[PDB]
Design a protein around this ligand. Sequence first.
Ligand SMILES: [Ca+2]
Length: 82
Amino acid sequence: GSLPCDICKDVVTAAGDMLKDNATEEEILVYLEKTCDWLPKPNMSASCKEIVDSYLPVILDIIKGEMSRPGEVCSALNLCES
Ligand SMILES: [Ca+2]
């Protein structure tokens, strides 16, 4: 998906790191949404926030299982080429 794929992978990486830091699921949601502001253009930051809102909760459920790396997780969600 290019951008949606790139964003998905950054999200999965960040979520995993925060979970290890004992962050709550809401703190992760709040933080990734704010990190989306690092994307240089308003439209890109906006699409990043929608991906975070739409996928972070399911990503948290997925990574509690056997699959936890960005590539494998984002390919499963079909945000990155299978
Ligand atoms: Ca900024």
